Amino acid sequence: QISVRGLAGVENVTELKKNFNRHLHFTLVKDRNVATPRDYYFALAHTVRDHLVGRWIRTQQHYYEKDPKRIYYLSLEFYMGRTLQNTMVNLALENACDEATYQLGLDMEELEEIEEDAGLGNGGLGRLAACFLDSMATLGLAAYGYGIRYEFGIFNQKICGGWQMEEADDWLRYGNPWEKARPEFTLPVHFYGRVEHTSQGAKWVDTQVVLAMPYDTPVPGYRNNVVNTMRLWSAKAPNDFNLGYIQAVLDRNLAENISRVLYPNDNFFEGKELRLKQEYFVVAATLQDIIRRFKSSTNFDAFPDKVAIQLNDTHPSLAIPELMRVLVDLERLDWDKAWEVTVKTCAYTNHTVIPEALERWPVHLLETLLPRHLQIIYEINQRFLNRVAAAFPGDVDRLRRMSLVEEGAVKRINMAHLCIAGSHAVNGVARIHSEILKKTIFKDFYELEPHKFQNKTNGITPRRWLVLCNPGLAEIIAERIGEEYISDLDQLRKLLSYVDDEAFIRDVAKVKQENKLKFAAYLEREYKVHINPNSLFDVQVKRIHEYKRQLLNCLHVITLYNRIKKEPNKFVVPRTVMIGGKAAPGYHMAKMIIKLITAIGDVVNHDPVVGDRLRVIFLENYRVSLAEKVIPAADLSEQISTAGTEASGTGNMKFMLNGALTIGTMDGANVEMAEEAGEENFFIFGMRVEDVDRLDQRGYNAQEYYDRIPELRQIIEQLSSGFFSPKQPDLFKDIVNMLMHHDRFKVFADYEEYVKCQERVSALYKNPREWTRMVIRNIATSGKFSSDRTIAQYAREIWGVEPSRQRLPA
Amino acid sequence: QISVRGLAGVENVTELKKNFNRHLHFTLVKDRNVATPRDYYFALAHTVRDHLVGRWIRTQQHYYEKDPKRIYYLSLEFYMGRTLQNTMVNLALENACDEATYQLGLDMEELEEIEEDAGLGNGGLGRLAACFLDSMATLGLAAYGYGIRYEFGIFNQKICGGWQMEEADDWLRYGNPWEKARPEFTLPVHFYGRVEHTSQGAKWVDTQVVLAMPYDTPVPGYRNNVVNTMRLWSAKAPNDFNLGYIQAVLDRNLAENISRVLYPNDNFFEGKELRLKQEYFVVAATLQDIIRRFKSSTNFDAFPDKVAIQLNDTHPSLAIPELMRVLVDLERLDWDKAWEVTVKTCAYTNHTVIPEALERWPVHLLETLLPRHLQIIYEINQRFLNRVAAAFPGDVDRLRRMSLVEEGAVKRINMAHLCIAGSHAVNGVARIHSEILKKTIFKDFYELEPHKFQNKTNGITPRRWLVLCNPGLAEIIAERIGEEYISDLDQLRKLLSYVDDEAFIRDVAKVKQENKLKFAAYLEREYKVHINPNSLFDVQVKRIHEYKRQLLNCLHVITLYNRIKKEPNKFVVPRTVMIGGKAAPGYHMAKMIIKLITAIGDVVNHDPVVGDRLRVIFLENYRVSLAEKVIPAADLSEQISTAGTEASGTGNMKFMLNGALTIGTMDGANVEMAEEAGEENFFIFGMRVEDVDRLDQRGYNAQEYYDRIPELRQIIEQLSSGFFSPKQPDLFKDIVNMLMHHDRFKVFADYEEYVKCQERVSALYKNPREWTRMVIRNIATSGKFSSDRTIAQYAREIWGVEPSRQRLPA
Ligand SMILES: CC(=O)N[C@]1(C(N)=O)O[C@H](CO)[C@@H](O)[C@H](O)[C@H]1O
């Protein structure tokens, strides 16, 4: 047992054991003779869950009594991952449970692997929401996460013949012990219908009704006895729905399809009706809940003092016109008063600048689905443009650029413009991203209301991303500076005075080696794949995207391979290149990239001459639980997106906190990370945002690079001739064609500097001691990237509430 | 507290209370400050449930050790009703829980009303299966009820404008505390595909796979510590199902629709594909489970010694060819050996003789859905007819009459013929019904294999239908003969020596009066309807059907009304005529009858001259929980189906056990009931089966009755002229037209004798003392109609197992 995992008291271990047996008997209705590991996992989950309820009930009762300002974090995604270990960590029950299960003759780590990931997210945006919930609870904020309870989360990725195959993520199959259905708080949500204009107000009538049933999941703060709530809505059809008879009953599924599945798109907008329904569904149900809670604390002037609504991107942007609809149509407030309340209540966070990810809904869709909201949006736009016109008289083009309504083929509503107009604060997720917002995408808006624009650099929770996934590292750190850093990551700074400490250097390196052995083993157990634990673990895990440039990584791998075949008996630092991530089902290029990766592996991994010097592995079904395993085992973190495309990135922070060195571009949060650790302790390369713009003004011509770089030329010719696809020589024609003629992300432009930088990485790896010393400098300066810091800034600069680290009663 | 409700021990009441509070806290995650009656109901349900698990686990472990012959009761319907009180009754926890909740300041009766009925049945057939499970557990048989877990059971009936409106029975909305999902025992079921004939055997390939997930519900025996299992299958789509992406995920519902809803038809066959899928689904999953359990006890010669499969009607008839498919195709047994095993394992129970209820599936449907089963059925038919041909040489018409395959417009498979051929026993559900089977419908089959035909008169469980719904009556009975009768109903005979006992007569009458007041009150509480508790409670509750002749009851009500208007100041015994029951959604005539009933009420209930002398009420949403309320409060039980149409009837037995006198035809079980109590203690009237046949040979002409009975003529003219439907004068034209020209059930033919008999009933009611004495004679002789007797006969004469009343350890 390690210190950071809590005490294994005599009384508590005994109590845990009896409750474990009670649940196995009464809850699972099983005896030890027929119980399977899954049954044991559930018995443990219910045992741990019991310890939450007491705190959950008093935390909520506490907020009722003290009535603080409530924070409502609206998101269509909450990438939670597993809950068992995280709960034990935050409740200081890990060692006790480890001991108790040990005495029952069970391996707790084996049981934890049985829990299904709650994959209600796609990647960064969803995971961010998860880290935020953890931090808000840890900082004692009366926060509520509101989203959708998807029956099917992000699809499970299978690799067949080197191709990605998707299969339903039936995560609720065996039941979810963490959620508590609250059917008693079911709310009605309206769709379609029409607008009637009577004497005293407009009415939305003849609507189709869908019920929203809430499910509450506890969110425990770190050892402070605070347990907040994440409320996920589930779609239910009313009972007089469609009410020949048989068909009417079967058609109930049409209404319940709203919460059936998560759209698997990462940084891409797909204007489908079902998605719009999901967005309004979560918004409509949540707002009624918010107002209900408010009225139970009618002058809505105090609404903004008791309520803060944070929009995670534009997905829940309809909250703005829905809040207006309710205040104006239902509560009968005058427009101006209602608008004042709305702006002061809502804040919007932008997560990207790539045009294809921007939500622009066709007016005809809103027209049919939400007629009243479309009217309110036109009215908002009207009054907004009147302000623009008055601020910039005669600037007609600005008016059309800022309009919430975009003209053209089909009129569309720019949801981002809607969010800026109806929010008192708009923020980017990293300094460079936030600056880009003010200088480009939202320049006109920043000019009109500069006070609205802020920055809130992303962060990650040190509980799940350090203590939970890397106990060995958390331990050796605690041994030298205590445990306070876990909820005050800035204290890792103190590790700077151990950079020359021989014992520490040795332990840091030892922990990494153990993590690598542990992962190298897992690889063979669950995926029959052998790798050399002594090689440098070069990993790039994140969603497959052209802007992420997994292709640039591929070019390097092929370069390494060609160099080896060129001079076989020459020494080179051994490397295990691991690339993992899911591709959106309809993203063809992303799926071709996955195939290319596996294709490269097929050649490289079986070339006798290469031996154990180079291995290319594609990490299947990358998800939160897998991240917790690979990240602690990585040496090199690949954060190589084209400058200006990765709003922030969070995977980069996870790697930095876990002892991996970073090779990347000055993009997103990488800039601040390098700034914190010092550029000398970072492997920075490639074009800066300015270099990219210069190239765009000049005109990007990939051919130029192809003509001037022999090694690059050789790679393209190998791809084109079928060297990596014998049976299908032209298999990768689309890839080569894109690289050569329409590469929006300038892969070739950063090739030379990338490769060169990679050589510097290999050189440092040859010097174990100095590599580890640089690692210590990174870990020691990663404190700024804790989501506790991020949330503290949101609370103080946007929500107007003070974080607290005071422990609530037991 | 009453004696039959068990002891309210000091230790147990204390234990119950703490566990109630534990569940409210840890299970429902609520505090007393926010708990609603529903939360309290669930806390109690979980508390009671806890007492079942221990016994449930050892009962099943017991069967594993002793390995007795297992009884598998296959049914597409299990009309369970509520489970809370029944569980308390069988566990002798009722008084303790009553006390415990009392001390917690809660009214247990109020909490029981919150439980949703498990309405997984239509009427008699489904309820019979429920009573049987209760009796099999009480008799210590290793029995398993196997069926489908419908998401939506029988629809909830709403009456709007006097018309029936159906609405989804979302009984799982708030969760079901009684079931235990067993996802670990999920089994695959195949559909469609084709048959491949290879060298060594035929193969069923290219099939669509649907998963069957089982949910187990405990079935406690009466105070014997036995807890059997009812396993209900739920349809689940495999995860690589349909696996653009979004659509594939949404289409999973196509496969899961199989267990979505119960077909609401009572005694009517609807040849829909979805229904056929449900039938094979339950059969395929169940048989794999049966064989699995058998192999874990490969000579299948002992299969019939360890397994008995009872087919509740033909709904699960595919078990016969499915068992053959498995034994022949999968286990590779020779046909003859397989057939021997199948016949010795299966037994079939017929529940009706009406042609429209007989299952005849179109060959083209089986051809597409279950190609292999169709081949097996042809093969069975072939060999079967060869036996017929050899037994009755040259009788070509017999061959075509007995064929499992019916020729004509579209070829169909007669499932009843299939069941007779593949079963070692076939039984009717009442003596007269069983005789009718041998003399008519299955005459040819009886001639070929007379040994197969048996009778097993239906019964009802005295636990739910006496002790649970009528504690007051169970108590006064127990006070004079003890409690042993509850599991040995024949002992009620002893009450015969109290027929002249003044105290007993007074108590029996008192209990009835209290039940009537209790019901008259409930009527006003939940349905704002006032009635006179001193009137005779004339009730007919059962599914709406023409053969049940609710119309004959209507004619009498109208007769009573017309007589009163004719002589207003003449005295007549006051009556409250209550009619209730659901009509199948697509059964037009049944829906018109409901409207007629409410229409009669509209006129009769508001006629000043009638006063409180006559009231016509339609009992809305008749279901098991409502039956438990009305039956104990009834004085007169209407069992007036045309002789030969009601196979048995079970509602009739419920009324007899609860102190109501019966007016009915010599049909179904009424014959045996009258035989048991003595015809002098029964109000028998109308045509006997023989009279009906005579009339059919002559030719039924309704006009004749219309011309010779003035009162009848007046009623038809009132209906035709719009007397009961002013705004819509011809509203009931279909009813009159049917009555006059195509009445398959000869309503007019029994009118005169019915009315006359009703006069005899009123006469006896005027003499309280003698009415009650006749009641005592009925209750005292109702013992034969206990399902314990029925099940004991099934066990000894069909399954070959001995019932046991021995209590298993605590
Ligand atoms: C739209 C969207 O999901 N954007 C992203 C992401 N996950 O892709 O949000 C996360 C969280 O802010 C950022 O770190 C990524 O750089 C940004 O692209």
Ligand SMILES: CC(=O)N[C@]1(C(N)=O)O[C@H](CO)[C@@H](O)[C@H](O)[C@H]1O
């Ligand atoms: C088919 C069918 O459900 N038949 C019925 C019924 N419920 O309608 O079965 C029950 C139980 O045996 C019998 O009492 C009824 O007389 C018979 O009609």
Ligand SMILES: *Cc1c(COP(=O)(O)O)cnc(C)c1O
């Ligand atoms: C952290 C995380 C991400 C975000 O990774 P980036 O490299 O910032 O894109 C995505 N997926 C999972 C499973 C994560 O844990």
Ligand SMILES: *Cc1c(COP(=O)(O)O)cnc(C)c1O
């Ligand atoms: C007993 C019962 C029946 C069967 O009634 P019959 O009069 O035999 O048709 C039908 N429905 C319910 C709810 C029952 O309790």
